[PDB]
Structure 1
C-alpha cells in the first residue's frame, strides 16, 4: 500500500512540496525550454504539474517550484522503508565541467593509496570486530583524510562544524550547522569560511592549509529540524575552486549499488574529526579537547539493534555505528565533527567513499547509546540536478 520503487509508478493526485510550495507544470516555460539538459526517462507520465520521478531519484518524486528558474522541491509521500542494509576503476557521474575536477581521481589518497602505502588502521577496517582489544581512537597521521574540511564562522572567528571535500568546487555538510532555528542558527554564505588541508585545529600550518570562500548554500529541500533532524544535509559551493595537494583530495560517493555492496562487504567505518560534535554541545570540557585531527574505526551494527536503542524512529536514510553500552567498557557517543565525514574504503577498487554525515543524534548525551549518522547514497541525483542549476 505504501509507495514502492521510489515514486516512479505514482500517478495519484498531489502536486506540492514537503514545505508547502506550488509545483510549476512540466509543460511550463522555464521547466520546458530552459530545463531539459538531462536524459530524462520517458516511462513516467509527465501529467500536468504532478510530482513525478523522471530521473529516478533515490529520494523520490519532485517538481520545479516558483522561484529562480531551476529550483525544485520534493513532495511528502508515503514511501516504503527500503532498508539499504540486509588500474583502480571508477566512472564519473556528474559532468566535470560543473562539478569541477577530481571526481575521476577521488578516494585515492596522495600519501597512502597512490604511494602504495597503508595507514596505521586501514588494515583493521577489513575485519569483523575481533573482540577484547578495542583499538581506541587517536592522533591522526598526516594526509590521512584529504577530504577533511573545517567550517569557520567568519566573525567573531569561530569553528562550527566539520565537512567533506567532494571535488575542487563542492563540499558536503550537515544542514543543521547552518539552518537550525531552535538555536537561531540561520547562517548564510557571507558569515562562513572554510579551511581545507588542516591537520591541527589551533596552530597555523604554513603553505599546507588553504582557506576559501563560499558562493551559494543549498539546504536539501526535505530537511526538517521540526522532528528528529531528518535529512541533516546541506551542500555548499566554493567561490574559489581549491588546488589538490598531498594534503587535499576529494572523496568518492556511493550510490545504492555501491553503498549496499560496501555495507555487505564492510564491517566498520571511520570517523575523522576534532571532537567538534562532542565538544560543541556545552557537554563542554568533559575533560580534554583534541588539538589535532582525531580518528576512530567504528563498526556499523545492524538496524534492529539500532532501532531498539533509541526512543525515536530511525529512517532508512539514518544509520548507527559504534560499540556496545557497558558498565566498564564505555563507547564513544557524539564523535568527531558535526556534518563531518564518516567513511568506508571500497575493497573493490581501494578508494574511499563517504557513507555518513554526523548528527546531533540525542543518543549522544544519553551516555550509553550509538552515534547516529546520515546516509549519502540518495543525494547523487539531487546533487546532479543542483549543479545543473548553476551552469558553466
Structure 2
C-alpha cells in the first residue's frame, strides 16, 4: 500500500495473510469461517500445494499475540478461464482445513448479492484496500497492516484518464479501476488478493480484489481490481460443493 496508513489493530478483521513455505505470499479476504477469497495469480508459481497457510487476526508481522489464528489451505479453487501469467479472472476461493474462530479481531467481510453490488455498491465513491504489500514502487513491504481509501472509476473513465501504452492488458468487464493517477496512492504487488471493501449503511462488503496495474502508484495509471460482483454465483455454488481430492481445483466459469 502506497500513501496509506496503518490499519489500527482490529479495524481490518477480515484481512488474511497467505504464506507459502512460511513465507509471505499474498493477502486475502475472509468471507466465512471456512472460506477465503484471494487472487488467482498468487498461485502461479506454487510448487508445494500442501504448504499453504492462511493467517487470520494478523496485524504486526514482527510480534506474535493471541488474536492470530493459522489454518492450512485445504483447497484453492481457480476459474478454468484464468491463464497463469495474465490478468483476467484474477480470483481464487480457498477452503480452510478447519474453521477459524470468530472474535473481536477475526470477522468475515460480507459477500454481497450481485445486483445490490452492481446497482448500489458500485456507485459508492470510496472503498478501502489493505495489505502488507510494498510501501513504495519497487520498495520493501510493510510490517504493520496498511490501509488506504481509494475512489472507484467506471472503465470508460479509467481508459480515458490513463496513459495509453503498448502491450497493456485490456480492462475487461471482470475488472474495475480505483485509485489515483497522480502517483501518490495505490495498492501494490504484495497486496494482491487483498480486500477492496465498500462501506454501505453500517456494513462492509467485498467489491474488489487487489489484482494488477502498471507498477505501483505510477503517474497516469490506476490500480485494477477483480470485479467480484461478476463472481457471486460462481463463489456461492462452489461454497455449497463437496471437497475434491487434490488442493488445486479449476472450476468452470461462468
Q: TM-score range by the shorter chain?
A: 0.7 to 0.9
Confirm or deny that 1:229 pairs with 2:81: no
- Which of the numbers 339, 356, 364 marks the counterpart of 2:208? 356
**1:149 corresponds to which residue?**
16
**1:377 corresponds to which residue?**
229
Confirm or deny that 1:194 pairs with 2:47: no
**2:100 corresponds to which residue?**
242
Deviation of residue 377 (structure 1)? 1.1
**2:63 corresponds to which residue?**
203
Confirm or deny that 1:338 pairs with 2:196: no
Residue-pair matches, total: 234
**1:213 corresponds to which residue?**
72
Distance 1:170 1:188, change over 3 A: farther
**2:251 corresponds to which residue?**
none
Superposed CA offset, 1:209-250 (max 9, x none): 111111122112221235x41011111101111110000011
Q: Distance in 2 between matches of 1:187 and 1:342?
A: 28
Residue correspondence of structure 1 range 300-319 to structure 2 within 5 A: 300-308=152-160, 309=162, 310=164, 311-319=168-176
Confirm or deny that 1:169 pairs with 2:34: yes
Contact 1:220 1:235 in 2 (8 A): no
Q: What's the TM-score once normalised by structure 1's chain length?
A: 0.56
Contact 2:15 2:29 in 1 (8 A): yes
**2:238 corresponds to which residue?**
386
SS, match of residue 186 in structure 1:
coil
Q: Distance in 1 between matches of 2:63 and 2:151?
A: 32
Q: What's the TM-score once normalised by structure 2's chain length?
A: 0.84
**Which 5+ residue runs of structure 2 have no aligned equivalent?**
244-254
Q: Distance in 2 between matches of 1:388 and 1:188?
A: 26
**Which 5+ residue runs of structure 1 have no aligned equivalent?**
1-135
Q: What root-mean-square deviation, in Å, do the aligned CA atoms of Structure 1 and Structure 2 show?
A: 2.1
Deviation of residue 302 (structure 1)? 3.1
SS, match of residue 29 in structure 2:
strand
Residue correspondence of structure 1 range 1-392 to structure 2 within 5 A: 137-154=4-21, 157-178=22-43, 180=44, 185-187=45-47, 189-205=49-65, 207-225=66-84, 228-260=86-118, 261-264=120-123, 266-276=124-134, 283-285=138-140, 289-308=141-160, 309=162, 310=164, 311-325=168-182, 330-335=183-188, 337-347=191-201, 350-362=202-214, 364=216, 366-390=218-242
Deviation of residue 331 (structure 1)? 2.1
Q: Distance in 2 between matches of 1:323 and 1:366?
A: 9
Runs of 4+ in 1 over 6 A off after TM superposition: none
Distance 1:333 1:221, change over 3 A: same
Contact 1:333 1:367 in 2 (8 A): no
